[PDB]
Each structure stands twice: as structure tokens, then as C-alpha cells.
């Protein structure tokens, strides 16, 4: 389960 | 992928009005003037060349500033702080890598502190009630560009130039809306370089006709003519570069035949 | 804040936690997202800046509603309407049941409803997935988490690359193109669509290249005919194994001829040929959609 790309 | 273009356009034609500053707001401004503003817009331009920010960023900023002074009284020693607070935002809004706050203090040469900038951030956000996605002349031109026949990169640049000149002069350009200025520019460019006019297709797309663009088309041309003698010049210096096909060096037509 | 009463933490993302809460004055039940500031950093997070504003202009029945924004001096609480649960939890309870075709159909239609709206308002969601969609006990679904969204223009510029959660990322992103647009949100819906149909993630990769291999193995390695340009894409390697497209009946058994056609059209390789939400909303697949209530 991959998280959401972050900035 | 032209499936949504029109819904978009429409929503932007509608939004532009909701994000349009009040025309003669400077009139009520006690301390600041159109001139100081020009000094401020012209420098923001410099600012975004030093950091390579997209033109969208500059436009979003000018829009933020205007709306804000639209309803707030600001002394001249601070206008710059308002200005800088808007460029931050605009950046965090439209850029992939927005300059960090510490960089913004440095370009003001420590005029304001970090904390002074952050607070103004909060304040601008309050006054604008976070309504940050404003339509800009740039969102309009970019769409109008699709109707060229064919695409001419000289015109594109020269139009961007024009629509950028209007960023500096509150008076008179607060009178017109982004979509109209963009038409004015788009037509001017076109005529100057290729001699074609606001094409039939755009007439159907926006409803605007050359005749409707006259009033703005009369100010714009004049602004073009007088470009070299204007107090502020960052934008000309800007449009000398090859990335812009030196369009600022081209000689404007003498008459528009309108 | 005086008027809200925190109940139980619903989730917890980046800049803070998330509580289910109730208003002591009016009884309204809400969802509060506490975005941190710390200050002395960069002020307001550019991600919070987008969420709020882009959401200021997205009022739609199929899009979570931003009630208010309390921008104090220490934090930033986004106040949201409160929905029951996201499509992930719901999909889990249907681990054996399988979501009935009609309910599903209702689901996708709404999503697409909300999705075309966004698109019509120049906004890319860029993080569509089940845990980021909320349903209510009434048979409604709604898009949520605009944390990763951005307003787009026309035509588009290059945007941020690190985007979309891995399993639901499109092939144009995986192969590193210069430009991506609406089609990325559809690729996601498509995967979600397939997922409702079999309750297991269509292409659950554990990496950029595995995601890519999973897509290939199901849709057949893209060539220049199907997607003009692929063999010039930055991350495209000519050594890619070349698999052959698989029959949709073996990929999506339960789907009938229509649902098949739409799905396939939602996962076209060539972004320029992928069905759009507007065109989707109109596929024959939806000619008989209704509004079933979920089991709960
Ligand atoms: N309004 C809501 N009602 C019920 N649950 C919610 C609501 N909003 C968010 N959640 C829950 O919180 C989780 C994360 O919130 P959200 O997606 O908005 O922010 P994120 O950090 O991007 O993730 C969601 O997946 C959902 O389960
Ligand atoms: Mg989320």
C-alpha cells in the first residue's frame, strides 16, 4: 500500500 | 484533447468578473499612487526573471495585489511587503518549486523580516478569502493561441509582451478584463507581425469582435508606441532576450485602421 | 474552535490528524483537518493553499464540501462535511459479497459526474483512489482529498511529476512524459472501476517498473500503432518484454459487453484517445443506471 506522493 | 475547453473558457469568463478589482481604487488610496504601483509591478517582473518563475506566477501576483489594495489602505513603506507577500503565494500556487521565504526576504534586501512576510501572507489570504485561482490574461491568450493559422511563435511572444505591458499601468488597464486585454494583445501582435486580425473563429468563441476591442485596442497600441519612453523598462529588457525572439525590438505599426 | 467537539480520529495524513466532530450549537457533524504551520518555516503549505482555493470553486453534489476554514495563528483547520466511510473500507466489507453491478454502476456514474465538473473547472485531481472517495448511507459517492490537485491551463504546461498513488498512476506518467492532463484522472477512475468489479486492485505494483509490467501484461505492450510516440518516451526501454493484450472477459469477467467497452476506453494507452468524463457519462453502459442504496 503506497502512500500519496509528497511535495 | 479539446473536450472541455469550452466549459473551462466559460467558467473562466465568469470567474474573471468575480476576481476583478474595483477600477479606481487608487483614487481612495491615501498614500500610494499608480506610480508607486508601477515601480512595484516592474520590480516583480525583475523578481521573476531572477528566479525563473512562470509568467502565470507574475500575473497571479499582480491580480492578488490589486484586489488587495482594492479594499485595504496601505502606506508606501509597506506596499512592497504586500507585493512580496503576493509573489510568495502566487508561487506556492502555480510553481513546481516555489522560492523559499528566506529567498524573498533577501531580494527585498532585508527591508522586511521573515515574520513580517509570513504575517502578510496570512493577511492577504484573509482579505482574498483564499480565493486564489484567478483567471489571467495569460490563461486567455494561451487559449486564443490555439486558433492561429498556423502557429507563429513570434506573435505568441509579442502578444505575451503586450499583455505584459498592461500589468504596469493600473490606469488605464484596470478598465478592461483579462479576456479583453488578451484579445487586444492577440490582435495587435498578429497584425504587427503577419497582418491578420482577430480571426472569425475567436469571434465565435468569445463573442468579442474587433469593434468591441477598439477601446482597449486604442490604449494598447498607444502603450506599445510609447514603450521605449516609459519610466519602467524591466519588461522591455526582458523581451529582448532570444527566448522571446526579441519581439520588443520590432517596430509597431503606425496605425490600426480601426 | 470553541464550538466544535472532537470525537474520534477519522484519519491522519500529512500536515496533521483528522477528527469526526460535532458542533455544539447546531448539531452539525463534521470532519476537521488540522494542518500544522509551526511558522518560521514557509508559512502556509502550498499544498494547503491549493486545497482550499481550488475547493472554493468546486461546489458539486459529488465532491466533498469545504464548510469553513479557521486560519488561526497556530494551526489551520479545514472543516468538512462528514461522510460515512471511503470506498476502501466499504470495498472491504464486501470482501465476499461483491458489490452488486447496479450499485457499482451508480458509483462510477457519480464519480464521473464529479470528475467532469472538475475538469470543466480546469482542475486535475491527480490522486483518485478508493480511500480518497467517500460514500454516504444514502447511495452517494463523493470525491475528496484535493490535497494534491492543481489548476490547469490550456494548453497545459509541464506539471509535477511525482504524482498519483502508484497503483492508480497512468502509463504516460510512468514513462515520464513532458505533459499530462485530464486523462490521468480517468486512468484512475478506470482502475477504480475495475476494482469495484473484482474487489482486488487491478494493477498493484510495488514499483514504477512493476506497475508498468503489470499494465503491459494486461493490456499488451504498447507499440507505435496503438500509441504513436511510446518508443520515444523518456523511460521507455526497447527491451520491454512484449506481452499480448488479454481478453477483457478474463480480466473483467462480470462486466457485460457495455461495461467492458467503457472500461477499455477508460484505459486507452494514448492519452489523446482516452475517453473523457463527459464522453464517459454518456456511454451506453449508463443507459439504465439508477441510484441503489448501499448495504450497511
Ligand atoms: N468528510 C469526511 N467524512 C468522513 N471521513 C473523511 C472525511 N474526509 C476525510 N475522511 C477520511 O480521512 C482520510 C484522509 O483524508 P483526506 O484524503 O481528505 O486527506 P489526505 O491527507 O490527502 O488523505 C480519508 O481517506 C477518509 O477516510
Ligand atoms: Mg487521501
DSSP assigned state of C253: S
Question: For cell 468489479, what's the residue?
Answer: C197
Is residue B157 exposed (0-12), middle (13-18) or buried (19+ Cβ within 10 Å)? Answer: buried
Angstrom distances, CA of residue C76 to CA of B122, C37, C38, C51, C209? 11, 7, 11, 12, 38
**Same-domain check for residues C3 and C122:** no
Q: Per DSSP, what are the bridge partners of residue C6?
A: C21
Strand partners, C18: C11, C33
Q: Verify that B144 and B235 share a domain, yes or no.
A: yes
Alpha-carbon gap, residue B46 to B44, rounded angstroms: 5
**Do C101 and C44 reside in the same domain of the chain?**
no
Q: Are residues C32 and C148 in the same domain?
A: no
Which chain B residues contact residue C271 at CB under 8 A? 1
Please tell me whether residues B125 and B56 are part of one structural domain: yes
Query: Would residue B170 be called left, alpha or beta, if left means φ above 0 and alpha means ψ between -120 and 50 degrees?
Result: alpha
Spatial distance between the Cα atoms of C34 and C22, rounded to a whole number of angstroms: 15
Ligand 1 centroid, distance to C18 Cα (angstroms): 7
Residue C41's closest chain B neighbor by CA? B101
β-pair partners for C77: C34, C70
Q: Are residues C54 and C121 in the same domain?
A: no
Residue B16: which of B121, B165, B197, B143 has the closest Cα? Answer: B143
User: Using a CB-CB distance cutoff of 8 angstroms, which residues of chain C are in contact with residue B130?
Assistant: 49, 52-53, 56, 69
**B155 in the same domain as B117:** no
Q: Is C127 within 8 Å of chain A by CB?
A: yes
In this structure, are residues C62 and C44 in contact, taking their beta carbons and an 8 Å threshold? no
B153-168 vs B55-69: helix crossing angle, rounded to 10 = 20
Q: Give the sheet arrangement for strand C85-86, strand by strand.
A: C85-86, C133-135, C141-143
Closest CA to C128 of C90, C183, C200: C183
Same domain? B124 vs B186: no
Q: What letter does residue C27 receive in the DSSP assignment?
A: -
Residue of B nearest to C279 (CA): B3
Q: List the CATH number of the domain containing B68.
A: 1.10.472.10
In a domain, B1, yes or no: no
Q: Identify the domain boundary among B98, B133, B168.
A: B133
What kind and span of H or E run contains C70? Answer: strand C66-70
Indicate the burial class of B149 (C-beta count within 10 angstroms; 0-12, 13-18, 19 or more): exposed
Q: Are residues C165 and A6, on separate chains, in Cβ contact within 8 Å? A: no
User: In the listed set B84, B102, B133, which residue is the last one of a domain according to the structure?
Assistant: B133
Query: What crossing angle do the helices spanning B55-69 and B137-144 adopt, rounded to 10°?
Result: 140
Radius of gyration of chain B (CA): 18
Q: Are B211 and B248 contained in the same domain?
A: yes
Does one domain contain both B201 and B183?
Answer: yes
Whether residues C264 and C130 share a domain: the answer is yes
**Domain count along chain B:** 2
Please tell me the experimental approach by which this structure was elucidated.
X-ray
Whether residue B162 sits in one domain with residue B34: no
Cβ(C248) to ligand 1 under 6 A? no
The verdict on the CB of residue C137 being under 6 Å from ligand 1 is no
SS3 C116: helix
Nearest CA to ligand 1 atom 1: C82
> Does B38 map to a domain?
yes
> Which of 31-90 (C) contact B at CB < 8 A?
39-46, 49-50, 52-54, 56-57, 69, 71, 73
Atom of ligand 1 nearest to the CA of C131: 25
Which residues does chain C have within 8 Å of residue A5's beta carbon, measured at their own beta carbons? 127, 148, 162-165
Q: Are residues C284 and C154 in the same domain?
A: yes
Contacts of C216 (CB under 8 A, 6+ apart): C222, C240, C241, C243
**C-alpha–C-alpha distance, residues C213 and C202, integer Å:** 12
Considering the domain architecture, whether residues B196 and B87 belong to the same structural domain is answered as no
**B53 in any annotated domain:** yes
What does the angle CA C108 – CA C49 – CA C117 come to, to the nearest 5 degrees?
A: 25
Give every CB contact of residue C210 below 8 A, 6+ residues apart in sequence. none
Residue with cell 470567474: B15
Last residue of a domain, one of C31, C62, C84: C84
Task: Quote the number of domains for chain C.
Answer: 2
Kindly list the catalytic residues of C.
127
Q: Is C264 on the interface with A (CB under 8 A)?
A: no
The parent domain of residue B69 ranges over 21-133
Closest CA to C165 of B187, B257, A1: A1
Q: Looking at the structure, tell me whether residues C76 and C142 fall in a common domain.
A: no
Considering the domain architecture, whether residues B49 and B150 belong to the same structural domain is answered as: no
Distance CA C160, CA B98 (A): 12
- DSSP helix, strand, coil percent of chain A (3-state; round to 5): 0, 0, 100
Please report, in range form, the residues annotated as the binding site of C.
10-18, 33, 81-83, 86, 129-132, 145
C-alpha cell at C94: 464486501
Residue C138 cell numbers, joined: 444514502
Q: Provide the resolution (angstroms).
A: 2.7
d(CA C246, CA B93): 42
Give the closest of B5, B92, B122 to C46, CB-based: B92
Residue C33 has φ and ψ, to the nearest 5°, of -115, 115
Residue B2 within any structural domain of the chain: no
Q: Per the domain annotation, does B157 fall within a domain?
A: yes
Strands across the sheet containing C66-70 = C4-12, C17-23, C29-36, C75-81, C66-70
The enclosing domain of C14 has a CATH number of: 3.30.200.20
Assess whether the C-beta atom of C83 lies below 6 angstroms from ligand 1. yes
What DSSP string describes C193-235? HHHHHHSS-SS--SSHHHHHHHHHHHH----TTTSTTGGGSTT
Give bridge partners of residue C182 from the DSSP assignment.
none
CB contact at 8 A, C118 and C124: yes
Query: Which of C47, C69, C84 is where one domain is finished?
Result: C84
Say if the Cβ atoms of C164 and A5 lie within 8 Å: yes
Task: State how far the Cα of B241 lies from the Cα of C277, in Å rounded to an integer.
Answer: 42
Q: Is C257 helix (H, G, I), strand (E, B) or coil?
A: helix
Identify whether residues C145 and C61 lie together within a single domain.
Answer: no
Print the domain residue range for C42.
1-84
Task: Give the integer Cα–Cα distance in Å for C155 and B251.
Answer: 29
Regarding whether C102 and C28 lie in a shared domain, the answer is: no
Q: Is C247 helix (H, G, I), strand (E, B) or coil?
A: coil
Residues C55 and C105 in one domain: no
The answer to whether residues C130 and C88 touch, using CB atoms and an 8 Å cutoff, is yes
Going by the DSSP 8-state scheme, the letter that residue C57 receives in this structure is T
Partner-chain residue, chosen from B8, B93, B138, that has the shortest CB–CB distance to C120: B8
Strand partners, C76: C35
What single string gives the DSSP state of each residue in C148-164?
G-EE--SS-----SS-S
**Do C294 and C139 meet the contact criterion of CB atoms below 8 Å apart?**
yes
Distances (CA, A) of C242 to B65, B205, C217, C225, C250: 55, 45, 8, 14, 19
**Shared-domain flag, residues C144 and C287:** yes
Among B140, B252, B242, which Cα is nearest to B190's?
B252
Asked whether the beta carbons of residue A4 and residue C46 sit closer than 8 angstroms, the reply is no
Is C211 found in the same domain as C72?
Answer: no
Tell me which residue of B139, B225, B145, B166 sits closest to B42, measured CA to CA. Answer: B166
Same-domain status, B109 and B126: yes
Q: Which residue of A has its CA nearest to C46?
A: A7
Which of B133, B153, B174 is a domain's end point? Answer: B133
User: Cα separation of C282 and B127, whole Å?
Assistant: 42
Is B139 in Cβ contact with C39 (below 8 Å)? no
3-state SS of chain B is: CCCCHHHHHHHHHHHHHHCCCCCCHHHHCCCCCHHHHHHHHHHHHHHHHHCCCCHHHHHHHHHHHHHHHCCCCCCHHHHHHHHHHHHHHHHHHHCCCCCCHHHHHHHCCCCCCHHHHHHHHHHHHHHCCCCCCCCCHHHHHHHHHHHCCCCCHHHHHHHHHHHHHHHHCHHHHCCCCHHHHHHHHHHHHHHHHCCCCCCHHHHHHHCCCHHHHHHHHHHHHHHHHCHHHCCCCHHHHHCCCHHHCCHHHCCCCCCCCC
Residues 6+ apart with CB under 8 A from B208: B179, B180, B183, B198, B202
Nearest Cα neighbor of C168 from C198, C196, C201 is C201
- What Cα–Cα distance (Å) separates residue C140 from each residue in C59, C112, C113? 15, 12, 11
Amino acid at each position: 500500500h503506497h502512500a500519496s506522493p509528497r511535495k | 484533447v479539446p473536450d472541455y475547453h469550452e466549459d473551462i473558457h466559460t467558467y473562466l469568463r465568469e470567474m474573471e468578473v468575480k476576481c476583478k478589482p474595483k477600477v479606481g481604487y487608487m483614487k481612495k488610496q491615501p498614500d500610494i499612487t499608480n506610480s508607486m504601483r508601477a515601480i512595484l509591478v516592474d520590480w516583480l517582473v525583475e523578481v521573476g526573471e531572477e528566479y525563473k518563475l512562470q509568467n502565470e506566477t507574475l500575473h497571479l501576483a499582480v491580480n492578488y495585489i490589486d484586489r488587495f489594495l482594492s479594499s485595504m489602505s496601505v502606506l508606501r513603506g509597506k506596499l512592497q511587503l504586500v507585493g512580496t507577500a503576493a509573489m510568495l503565494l502566487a508561487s506556492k500556487f502555480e510553481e513546481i518549486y516555489p522560492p523559499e521565504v528566506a529567498e524573498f526576504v533577501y531580494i527585498t534586501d532585508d527591508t522586511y523580516t521573515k515574520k513580517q512576510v509570513l504575517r502578510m501572507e496570512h493577511l492577504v489570504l484573509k482579505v482574498l478569502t483564499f480565493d486564489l485561482a484567478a483567471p489571467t490574461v495569460n490563461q486567455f491568450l494561451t487559449q486564443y493561441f490555439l486558433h492561429q493559422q498556423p502557429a507563429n511563435c513570434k506573435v505568441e511572444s509579442l502578444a505575451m509582451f503586450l499583455g505584459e505591458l498592461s500589468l504596469i499601468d493600473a490606469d488605464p488597464y484596470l478598465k478592461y478584463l483579462p479576456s479583453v486585454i488578451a484579445g487586444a494583445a492577440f490582435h495587435l501582435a498578429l497584425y504587427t507581425v503577419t497582418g491578420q486580425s482577430w480571426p472569425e473563429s475567436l469571434i465565435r468563441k468569445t463573442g468579442y469582435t474587433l469593434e468591441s476591442l477598439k477601446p482597449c485596442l486604442m490604449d494598447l497600441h498607444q502603450t506599445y508606441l510609447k514603450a521605449p519612453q516609459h519610466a519602467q523598462q524591466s519588461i522591455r529588457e526582458k523581451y529582448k532576450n532570444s527566448k522571446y525572439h526579441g519581439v520588443s525590438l520590432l517596430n509597431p505599426p503606425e496605425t490600426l485602421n480601426l | 474552535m470553541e464550538n466544535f467537539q472532537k470525537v474520534e480520529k477519522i484519519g491522519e495524513g500529512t500536515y496533521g490528524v483528522v477528527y469526526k466532530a460535532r458542533n455544539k450549537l447546531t448539531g452539525e457533524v463534521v470532519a476537521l483537518k488540522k494542518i500544522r504551520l509551526d511558522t518560521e518555516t514557509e508559512g502556509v503549505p502550498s499544498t494547503a493553499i491549493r486545497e482550499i482555493s481550488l475547493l472554493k470553486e468546486l461546489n458539486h453534489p459529488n465532491i466533498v464540501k469545504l464548510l469553513d476554514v479557521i486560519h488561526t495563528e497556530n494551526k489551520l483547520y479545514l472543516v468538512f462535511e462528514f461522510l460515512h466511510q471511503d470506498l476502501k473500507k466499504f470495498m472491504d466489507a464486501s470482501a465476499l459479497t461483491g458489490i452488486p453491478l447496479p450499485l457499482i454502476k451508480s458509483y462510477l456514474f457519480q464519480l464521473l459526474q464529479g470528475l467532469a465538473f472538475c475538469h470543466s473547472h480546469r482542475v486535475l485531481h491527480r490522486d483518485l483512489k478508493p480511500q480518497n472517495l467517500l460514500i454516504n448511507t444514502e447511495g452517494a459517492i463523493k470525491l475528496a482529498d484535493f490535497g494534491l490537485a492543481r489548476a490547469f491551463g490550456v494548453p497545459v504546461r509541464t506539471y509535477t511529476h511525482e504524482v498519483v498513488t502508484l497503483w492508480y498512476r497512468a502509463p504516460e506518467i510512468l514513462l515520464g512524459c513532458k505533459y499530462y492532463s485530464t486523462a490521468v484522472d480517468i486512468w484512475s477512475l478506470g482502475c477504480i472501476f475495475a476494482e469495484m468489479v473484482t474487489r482486488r486492485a487491478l494493477f498493484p505494483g510495488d514499483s514504477e517498473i512493476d506497475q508498468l509490467f503489470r499494465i503491459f501484461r494486461t493490456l499488451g505492450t504498447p507499440d507505435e500503432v496503438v500509441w504513436p510516440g511510446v518508443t520515444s518516451m523518456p523511460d521507455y526501454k526497447p527491451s520491454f518484454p512484449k506481452w499480448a493484450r488479454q481478453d477483457f472477459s478474463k480480466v473483467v469477467p462480470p462486466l457485460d459487453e457495455d461495461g467492458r467497452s467503457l472500461l477499455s476506453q477508460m484505459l486507452h494507452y494514448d492519452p489523446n484517445k482516452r475517453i473523457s468524463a463527459k464522453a464517459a457519462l454518456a456511454h451506453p453502459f449508463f443507459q439504465d443506471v439508477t441510484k441503489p442504496v448501499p448495504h450497511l
